[PDB]
Structure formats: structure tokens, C-alpha cells
Design a protein around this ligand. Structure first.
Ligand SMILES: O=C1O[C@H]([C@@H](O)CO)C(O)=C1O
Ligand SMILES: O=C1O[C@H]([C@@H](O)CO)C(O)=C1O
Ligand SMILES: O=C1O[C@H]([C@@H](O)CO)C(O)=C1O
Ligand SMILES: O=C1O[C@H]([C@@H](O)CO)C(O)=C1O
Ligand SMILES: [Mn+2]
Ligand SMILES: [Mn+2]
Ligand SMILES: [Mn+2]
Ligand SMILES: [Mn+2]
Ligand SMILES: [Mn+2]
Ligand SMILES: [Mn+2]
Ligand SMILES: [Mn+2]
Ligand SMILES: [Mn+2]
Lengths: 387, 387, 387, 387
């Protein structure tokens, strides 16, 4: 009973994940910098399908066009040598001091123009390398104090930025879509579009909404105490789950980025159940950081457990839904009725139906147990292999 | 220096607020039930503009049509006697045991039909009494366990319910709009549409989106650790702030419903600054519970402090925005630049502008301080009257 | 592979747990009241070892001495008929309106005297029924506002109450110890002694500290975002784990009281690992509420899953510690070194040791990986039975 | 109406506070390094009374004894030139990679010995510079995973470390006491002794408890959602408030370290009320970070607002307690009764008192309102200067 990934499982990793040197707000790096081409090689040996990058992960900030082309050629050779893909790319609009008040919603106009130019340059590279999804994480968009940011004005600037990006892509004829990644706080005191629902709502006000979806992250919704599978279900319902970031988080605190399966393990089970049963077909991307306690052996051990835990949870969720006793429990709890229209007979028929009100026996209905606890222990037994 | 409300301040209260008997999960009622007509009279004397109700606050669950008409006539006489209005009404789809798995997203279809019939009956009454806004708080819509609720199916049923309600209103020719009230948890382990952003996103998938907005509550967004003024700004930006619930909350815990001004007092300041500067013109509604430590004198003291605190914060926010030294600080922090388009010159001009990238001096831009801390201490001095 | 409890597993339940009628802050009871003697019989059939009670669970508030003796005789017959024990008892100082500002720290002195008299009466009964532990949960001790409670004065009154209780027990010659149960909030805005550490610290100021320990509850420490196994380890380290309350909680929100194993499942694993490896020998008590969605079949299903989940986690934790590959990983991560004295050679030798400072190679030490991620995935594989 | 600090207000600042360069988990430094002697001069001009330091703030890690003595002489000249004091010192056991698994509870024994030697060297310097308090913040003591740290063994090592430090001080005849600073998480997934109560409890197991107290930090207790004034009251009650760290925090998230008065402003009011009315006479120390949005002008503006906000809150708290109408409200709410013994008449008299039970009228007692809401609005009016 082993759980070996192959490139057909669509597992991806950011360069910055296994590449995290372990600098935290209170401590220096505990690991040396990794060459991108070493990370590509090591991830291919563990069974990954591809990698993702920020511009500045791949090409050092301030690189000349000569150095740029060098970095890209070495990278491209490692992808050719391994068969690794690049399904997603993104921009670093958070590290450089110039971004201290944001990129697209910086109060200084010149900064906002610079943010857009830096982004557009990396969309061209992403397209060259074959990415299908371009992620936007506005980690510097927000405030520590109420007077620093008019949020209506800041949403105007955010909408303006994404519309220009949408204009750019369509004018170039690129086949790339955008995915906005919410986060509620950190590094800003509050971040704009802090959850999946705020990002989905914002998208509906862009000039071309069909170009934009969400990239939700496990630990980011959990930093607001929200149910991550529920938010994914709403993203799926809206047709906007373009990409996903998988990791673990222990409750409401700083962003831990633990390997996938750590943190809330039952949430991880229900997440995998939903992605698999909804037939999500995008990358299974890990946005995680190996703890700074670890050396490079612990780095690759952590990246491998990401994939392992996904595959174990996939097996247990599938055994759960395939169990006849579970299918019977689901009927007992009326999940079949949840899927039926309330009033396909229409409004007037509803209004005329005395069994819906005048003659509805509310005490008999109230008395029916939902049988959720038996259902939930079957799920528990399946997760633990006690079934 | 006093702070006396008048009906022109548009302060409203639910019957269930000053009427809360003080039953909590661990204790019996500490106060006797109030007659609605007593509450109408006492709130009119304190300077309120109107009251709101759930169906079951006004007419006891299971009332005959004869008793119903009696309750309504007494109520209507008290409104005539006081000049109090009824700007908003809502449905109780949470107290009765029949609603233990929800109203509109109950797994049992018969329950969902009953929920819609109970709602429609109260929309007719609300219209009769002159309400302009109908609130929907789906406090029983959600789950304690992952297998109990398919959330895609449950959003389908939620959409179906709100579309039928929209069909009903338009067929009757009623001038009433709907406001969805988010809450993240309690009494369900997780509640569907848990924040303002999730409710805004959902609305965009209804058949007639222009009929629906949000009713955000201070303490409910704060139960997810979110910035309430930021979520209101996004609701204002979308044109969907139909109504608002004002109260106080101390952080991430059970729903406290403290009087307005308690809880996060700086958030309350920034909220009032925003409602007043955006020119919000709906009711200022208090959804609060006087602590069960209190007798009826403490009830009316608490309701009065709601209004007082709003008026004190209104004065301090206005003095803040009117202060020349503040207007100068706002320019120092480039709030004026935040309000200017990033690229009114358009995409091609942006692309051709060397000052936006090739010749942008990122170190000079990085070095400019934002001066937010001086701005925030001016706001502090204004709030405390130390200015 | 089944997991059947016997009375030798020391599983206990409060009468109020399976007896919870499902009244919540927003809804009426969904279940009828259970007779205590029915609950005793049903729990004995599921394999429990005993039950616990508040005074008012067993004897209705205001009962005459004639009714009191009746209730107790019926109860005692059910225990004789089933072989069920009563290892713990406690007082209801939270439900009655008289306790709205607390019992032992109520501002009204007369109330505080009444609280002590009500407590002492139930200690005599507890002793009669054989309880070894008397729990104190001061759920009404605290405040919603800062001026309502001087906390120094309130700790003085709390200390006074517990000292008098300690005087009472020793004067009667009773073999009973006290266990204080912390909770951070709910139903009060803040509760005094809000965590395990605050309760442990308080105990050290009582006149007879050896009479008092803690009764920690899973969901209560998790309501402050704390690591429950870490707090139990500190209680074990102090010698003060007199009793424990087992249940589940999903993060920082209202007190859910889900069955044990729900909530944070990895915390539950590490908790069972610690109780079993430290050789805790008190009751395994479930303080949980079957969700109000359930009928009586779902009640007994939920109580049974409490016990099942404990036994599954016991097996997986034992397999984890017994695995040679785990024992090797533990050495790799230097858990053996953590258990050795830092400086058994004493202070002067430490000071004279050049290898501890002058000649300590800090870069070689820094470079050693901790290998925690491989250890943690072995724990994961063991929990999931993927091992 | 201004609020000018003098050195008699006992305001202190860490070198690392105004010296924070603005490196966060996601971004580079936004400010250049400050010379300690510049910070001493600038803080003296703003009215501070003294500064505090980590060893590595003052003397660069790895400094030769020649460089060490140089750094110290320059520092000492700036203190002589300004009249600034050094009331507290501490050790950096968190930045260097060698401390990635802790200092005193590192799994590697050699590291733990090195941590103690590094500490002892800085106690000698602290004594030389006149510090009265030595702070210990074990920010690296804890774990991201359950198998990485046996917490009983780790408390044994923590106790061993503090006992050796206590032995050292007493053998040298130094007049210095220790203050343990709790934090619940960050940078470790969970930190040992995570709150004030856990630190107080631990102290009671040291060989010489009278040498040790707590250094609580505003934002650290609030990261667990705890009431900071309540935890200070318990520290005061135990006689263990040796030192305090003042700052602001917006709820349960990463450690913000905002200037004092930001964050929870009503908690700040109640904190100042308590320190002033209990007559706390230690330093008023600011452990804060000027946001990385700021230049050096915004640094000194932020440090100045720390002090200003303390002085404004001091004035409002004093006006609150001095108001006759408040003193009357306090009696109305029976705060005077809270301060009286419950049973100075003793146990036997309590037992014989029929007015405490047999003849206690529980309904009359229940019916008395606490009048807390009127009290709390008077506090509100005083804080806002609306009084
Ligand atoms: O682009 C991203 O950056 C952050 C972070 O991973 C960098 O540490 C994250 O959440 C992304 O998806
Ligand atoms: O309709 C509502 O019900 C809840 C609650 O106030 C009832 O206690 C609330 O949040 C509303 O807006
Ligand atoms: O005595 C107790 O009461 C509360 C609660 O279970 C009553 O619902 C609890 O936490 C205890 O241990
Ligand atoms: O010694 C300390 O270090 C941390 C931090 O301020 C360093 O950023 C803090 O909380 C202390 O009191
Ligand atoms: Mn993250
Ligand atoms: Mn991410
Ligand atoms: Mn509420
Ligand atoms: Mn509300
Ligand atoms: Mn509980
Ligand atoms: Mn309990
Ligand atoms: Mn801090
Ligand atoms: Mn500190």
C-alpha cells in the first residue's frame, strides 16, 4: 500500500516553496539558495508534473536583458531535460521596498504604472514558457490604518489594473487567464479582497469577467476561520476555480504554509473529496514552505509528503463515496432531496399548494432526525482506514 | 456638549433587540417578555425613527388569522400614536425545530417549500406596513460536518429560493428590495455565504440581481477577523449597501451583539466616517442585545448608548475630515493620487512610456515615506477630542 | 478490526451531554428531556464506565427534600442495576438568573454566599455517590465591560470561595479533590481564569494547593487558538491533571462541543498519544452535545463515536511509538537529547567549558537539520493506517 | 491641552523598535540601519526615560572583545550625554540559525549549553549598565509538529535553564530579577508558555520563584483573543508584574507591534486605568515596530504617538475614577460589595446562616439589575471626552 505520484497526477510546486531559505520576521536564512535548475531536476525525480515561478524567482531583480536571456535559457534546458511543465506564472509585487504601499493600489501613481509594466513583461514570458494561468496575489494591497487607504478609490485602481491587463492579453491574442489569490492579512494589517467571496464579487465588475477566476489557498481562508471546502464549492458553483494552492494551516495565526495534509486534516479530506468529485482538472499546486528547522533532505521529504497526503486522501474519499453503506446513509440524511428543485412546479403552484403551508405538519417534519452523526462517523472510519 | 437623537437621524431597532429576554446557551431568561407596543413607545421616547421585526416577533408562531389581525392592529395603533416607521422586515427561519437543518437549503424538500411560503406571507405584511427592505439572515443554512451538505446543491437551492422571491415581488408590483445578511458561523458550525464578499458574489448569479443587496453586520464580519469598514467600502463600490446592522463585538468568538461603540471602537469611528462621507441614506439599524446582567432600566440605557455613540463618532469623523491639518496630511500620504486614474492615457501609451519602466527610478520611489503614522495619530487625536 | 469499549476503558459522560435538548441562542429544543435513569441504562449498553452530573441535572432546581431523596433513590437503583459509577460531580452555578453576574465572584455578596451553600450541599451528595473529583466551571465569573468587575477583587473572592471549600472537605474528612475547568469566553464576554495556565497559577495561591487541579476541555483551549496537547503536558508536568473533558472544536468560535475526534483530528491523535504515554489513569470524560439536527438514534450514535474515536487513536498512537522506524526517526531528531540534562555538571563547570562558548562551532550546529518533517509524515502515515 | 512626556513618566523603548528596518516575511528592508547612539539621542529629545537592548542589538554577533568594548563605550557615552537609563536588557536567542529549534529547549544539548553561556555573558553587561530587569522571550521554544518536542522534557530543560540563571545571579550577588515574556505562536507554530497564565504557573516550580515574574505584551495575549487587562490583573494579584510591553494589535493574526493606542483602543484605556490605579512603578516600555511604509520622520512620529496615547488615556482614566457620578454608578453596580469578604464570619457561621440558603430569596436577588451598561457608557463618554 503505497502512494507514488506520477506526472499524470498534475502535482506542481512554486520555485519559491522548496526554494524558501527560512528567513522569517525573527531569524536569518537557515538554508542556502537553490538554483532553479536543481529544483526542477529534484522535483521531477519525486514525480511532480511541473513548476511555477514569480518573475524575480527566475530572473534576479535588476538583471540586464543579457542575464535575463541566460537565466531563461538554462531554465528551458532543465524543463526539456525533465519533461517538466510550467502551468502558471505570477509577478513579485511584494518584496522590493518600492511596493511597500502596494503595486496596483499604491497611493503613488508612478508606482502603480511601474507595477503594471513589470506584470506585462512577465505575462509575455509566461506565455513563452507555456503557462495557461497567470496568478495575481496582491499581498501589499491594503493598510495598517484607516486613513491611509480610501478603499473605493483603491478598488477603482484595482479594477483599472486588471482591465488593462485583460486589454493587453486580448490585443496580443494570448490564451492565458488570470486567477486572483485572496489573503485576509499579512503582510498588510488588512489586505484588499481578503477572501474567495470578495475576489469573486470583484471579478463581476471587470470589463471582461470571463478572463478572471480565483486561486484560493488553503491556509489563507483558514486565517479568517472560514471552511475552505465550502469556499471552493462556491468558486466551483460560479465556474471560477481556475487554479488552487494546497498547503496546511493551524487555525487563525500567521501564514504557516505547512505541507499539504498538515494543519486541518479533516478539511483536507473534504477538500480532496470535492475536487475529485467535481472533476477539477487544473494543477494541484503546493504553495508551502519547508520549516526552517530542516536541511535539504527535510525539504525534499516535506515536498514528497505533500503529494503522498493528497494521494492517501484521494483513496479514502473514493472509498467513502463508493461504499454502499455510505450511499444508504446519504439517502438517510436526504442528500438526494437537497439535489432536487424546491419548486420546479413554479411559483403559482407553490402558492396554491396547501401541503406547503396551510396543511404542512411542522411537528412531524421537526421530529425527523437528520442522521448526520452516523454519516460523519462513517466518513471518520473511512479517513482512518477503520473501514 | 450633548448628543440627542432625533427621528431625522434614521435610528432603528429590531423588536428582538430591546426585547431579548436573556436566554443564552447556558442560562434562563433574566427579563420578562416585552409587549411590542411598549417597545415602540419607549424607543419613540428615546428618539428612534422606527422599528423592524421578524414575523414571529410580532405574531406568535401558530397564531390564528383572527389573532394575527389583532396583533397587527395593536401594532399599527402604536406606530400611528408615535410616528414610528417600519423600514425593514424579515422572517424567522431559525427558531422552530423544523428549521434545524435550514429553511431554503434544508435537505428535506417539504421544509424548503414551507420556508418559502412562510417568507412570502411576511413580505405581504412588510409591504402593508411600509417596509422598503426585506432582510434574509440564513442562520440555519450550513453544516457541522462535511458529508451533511453538498454546497453546490445547497447554492442551487438558495438561488432557487431567492429567484422565486424575486418573481413574487415583481408579479405583485411591490417596491421592496432584498438584503442578504452574512454570518460566518453560529448557530451552524459553518454558515453558507459567510461574509459580505460571499453574499455579493452570490447575488451576481440571481436572475434579477438589481433586486438584491447586502445587510452587513458589524459583529458578523469581525467574527471572521475581517475589517468591517473595508467590507462596507466594497459593498458601497458594488452599489449593494441596502441596509446595515450596527453593534459591537470583541474579536473572534461567539456573536456578542454588544451595543454600538462597544467592541472595536476605532473600527466604529472608521465605519461612521465612511457611511457619512459616502452619503449612505438607509436606516441606521441596531441589531444588539442588552446584556442579561441588566434590568429594563439597563435595556433602555443600552439602546440610548447605541445612538449616542453613533452621534459622538459622527462629530469626531466630521471634525477629522474638516481639519486643514488633516487635509494636508492626506495630501502628504498621496490619498489624492490614489483617486487619480493609473493610466487614463491608455494601454499603448503606458507601454511606450519609458518613465513607467525603462527609466523609472525605483530606489527614489522606494525611499519616499508614506507618512501614515502621523495621519493615523491625527485621527486618534480627533477621536479622543485631544484636538 | 473493531473497537469496542468496555467499562475498563474508563469512558464517562455527563448527564447533560446525551441529555442536551438542543436549545441554542437562536432556537428551541429539538428533543424531549431524557430521564437520568434512561441515560444510565443506554450508556451502560454502549460500554461506558460511568456518568457525571450537575446538582440540577439530577434534582430539579427547587425540589423539596422529599423529591430530592426520590430522585437520588431512583438514580442509585439505576447505577446498582448497571454497575455504572459516578467518578465526578459538579454544581450548576450558571443557569438560574440569580447567577447572571457569577456565583463565587458575583458583585452581590448575598449571591456569593448562596453559591457556596449550593456547592457544599452537592459535595455531600457527590461523596455519597462515590465521586472522587469535584469539578468547578465558573462560566458566569467574568464581564462584558471593563468597569463591571475589578479582577483583583474578583480573584480575592474566588480564592476565598475555594479556600472555604477546602476547609469544608478537610473538616468532614472527605476524600475528594477539586478540579477547576478553564474557559476563555462564553457565556461571559471574558471568563476569569481563561486557560489551563491561568487556572494552574491561581491554584498555587490557595491555602491548600494539593487539594486542587485542573479539568481542561479540548474545545475550551482551542477557543483561544492554543495547542491542547501542550497545555495538558504542562498540567501533567505540574502534577495537576485531575480530570479531563474530551470533545471537538473547529477553531476559534462559539463552543461547539462536537463529539471527540471531530474538530482538530491531528490534535486528538497527539492528545491520546500523550495521555497513554504519560499513563493518565483518571476518567476519559466526554463533555459533548449531539447536534440539534439529530433524533435520539443520532444521540446514541454520536456518544458511541466518542468512544470509538478514542480507541482508534489509541491504537494508531501505540503503533506509532512502537515502530522501530519511528524510534530511529526520534533519535534522528534528537528527542533523546531533549531528555538529558543540559548541565548536570553544574554551573561552574558550564562556565569553565570552552566547548559551550569560546570554542563552540555555531555554524556546524546551525547546519544540522532537525528532520522533523520526516518524523511528522511517519506520524501522518500511522494516523491514516498508510502504515 | 497637550500631553508632553518627561523622563519622570518612565517611558522606555527597545533599540530594535525604532531600529526596525522593515524586513517582513515577504519583503526587504525599507529603512537603513540606525546607530544605537543616534536612537539614544533622538529618543531623549522626544522625552523618553531610557532604552533597552538585546545583546546583538548593541554588539554585532561575532564581535571580538575589542569591538565589544568599543560598542559599549560609545553607548555609555551617549547615555552619559543624554541622562538616558537602561532599565532592562535581554538576549537574542532567536535570530541566528543555530537557534532554529530553540535556545533553552533546543533538542541538541550543545545548543542549550551555548544558549545559557550567551545569556550569562549578557547578564554581566546588563548589570554593568544598571538594568534592574532581565527579560527572557523564548520565541524559538516550541514546535510546528507534535512528535518534534516532548513538552514535559522541554519544561524540564526550561526549568533547568532558569534555575541555573537564578544560581548565577545569587552567586554573583547581583540585584537583577528575571521576567518571562509569553507569546502564543510566531515564529514557532506553537510557543511554550504561550500566555501570562502559563508563565505564572511555570514560575511556581522554579527553585527560587521570588527571582522571576512576567513581562506581558499587549499584542501577545491578544493573539490568543485574551483580555489583556484581565491577565495583567492576575499578574498584579500574584505580585509578579515585573515589567510590561506596550503596543497595539488588531485581533488574532500575525504579531503586528503597532504603536501603543492603535489596535484595541478600549483595552488600552482599561490597561492604563489598571496600571495607574494599582500603582505600577516599573518602566512603561514600548515594544513596537514603525510600519515599513514609513521613513525616519514617520519612525519618530510613531514613537512619539506611543507616549502621547499613554498620557491621553491616563488623563481620561483619572477623570473617570474621579467623577462623582462614576463613583455612584460603581456603587450602583456593587463594585463595593465585590471588595468585601464573602464569609469573614467563617465556614461554620456560613453553614448555620439560613439567609444564605434555606431562606435566601433567589428570585428577588435574580431580579436586581447590575447596571453595567450605564457604567460602561460613562466610561465611553470619559474616553471620548464627551464628559
Ligand atoms: O505568489 C504568491 O506569493 C505568496 C507567497 O507564497 C510568497 O511567500 C503566495 O501566497 C502566493 O501564491
Ligand atoms: O434576523 C436576524 O436575526 C439575527 C439575530 O439578531 C436574532 O438574534 C440577526 O443577526 C439578524 O439580523
Ligand atoms: O460543568 C460544565 O458545564 C459546561 C457545559 O458542559 C454545560 O453545557 C462545561 O463545560 C462543563 O464542564
Ligand atoms: O525580546 C523581544 O523580542 C521580541 C521582538 O520584539 C523582536 O522583534 C519581543 O517580543 C520581545 O520582547
Ligand atoms: Mn500562504
Ligand atoms: Mn499562495
Ligand atoms: Mn449578531
Ligand atoms: Mn443582524
Ligand atoms: Mn465546551
Ligand atoms: Mn466541560
Ligand atoms: Mn510582539
Ligand atoms: Mn515584546
Amino acid at each position: 500500500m503505497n502512494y507514488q505520484p506520477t506526472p499524470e497526477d498534475r502535482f506542481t510546486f512554486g520555485l519559491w516553496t522548496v526554494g524558501w531559505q527560512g528567513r522569517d520576521p525573527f531569524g536569518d536564512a537557515t538554508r542556502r539558495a537553490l538554483d532553479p535548475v536543481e529544483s526542477v531536476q529534484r522535483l521531477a525525480e519525486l514525480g511532480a508534473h511541473g513548476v511555477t515561478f514569480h518573475d524575480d524567482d527566475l530572473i534576479p531583480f535588476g538583471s540586464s536583458d543579457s542575464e535575463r536571456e541566460e537565466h531563461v535559457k538554462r531554465f528551458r534546458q532543465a524543463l526539456d531535460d525533465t519533461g517538466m511543465k510550467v502551468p502558471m506564472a505570477t509577478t513579485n509585487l511584494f518584496t522590493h521596498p518600492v511596493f511597500k504601499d502596494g503595486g496596483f493600489t499604491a497611493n503613488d501613481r508612478d508606482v502603480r504604472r511601474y507595477a503594471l509594466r513589470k506584470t506585462i513583461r512577465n505575462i509575455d514570458l509566461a506565455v513563452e514558457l507555456g503557462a495557461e494561468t497567470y496568478v495575481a496575489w496582491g499581498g501589499r494591497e491594503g493598510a495598517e490604518s484607516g486613513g491611509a487607504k480610501d478603499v473605493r478609490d483603491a478598488l477603482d485602481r484595482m479594477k483599472e489594473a486588471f482591465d488593462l491587463l485583460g486589454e493587453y492579453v486580448t490585443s496580443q491574442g494570448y490564451d492565458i487567464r488570470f486567477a486572483i489569490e485572496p489573503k485576509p492579512n499579512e503582510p498588510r494589517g488588512d489586505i484588499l479582497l481578503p477572501t474567495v467571496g470578495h475576489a469573486l464579487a470583484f471579478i463581476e465588475r471587470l470589463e471582461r469577467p470571463e478572463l478572471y477566476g480565483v486561486n484560493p489557498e488553503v491556509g489563507h481562508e483558514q486565517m479568517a476561520g472560514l471552511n475552505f471546502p465550502h469556499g471552493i464549492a462556491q468558486a466551483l458553483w460560479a465556474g471560477k476555480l481556475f487554479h488552487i494552492d494546497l498547503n496546511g494551516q493551524n487555525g487563525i495565526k500567521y501564514d504557516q504554509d505547512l505541507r499539504f495534509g498538515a494543519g486541518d486534516l479533516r478539511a483536507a479530506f473534504w477538500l480532496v473529496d470535492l475536487l475529485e468529485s467535481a472533476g477539477y482538472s487544473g494543477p494541484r499546486h503546493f504553495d508551502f514552505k519547508p520549516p526552517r528547522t530542516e536541511d535539504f533532505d527535510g525539504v525534499w521529504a516535506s515536498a514528497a509528503g505533500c503529494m503522498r497526503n493528497y494521494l492517501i486522501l484521494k483513496e479514502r474519499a473514493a472509498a467513502f463515496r463508493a461504499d454502499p453503506e455510505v450511499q444508504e446513509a446519504l439517502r438517510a440524511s436526504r442528500l438526494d432531496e437537497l439535489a432536487r428543485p424546491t419548486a420546479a412546479d413554479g411559483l403559482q403552484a407553490l402558492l396554491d399548494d396547501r401541503s406547503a403551508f396551510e396543511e404542512f405538519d411542522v411537528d412531524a417534519a421537526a421530529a425527523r432526525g437528520m442522521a448526520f452523526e452516523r454519516l460523519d462517523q462513517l466518513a471518520m472510519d473511512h479517513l482512518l482506514g477503520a473501514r
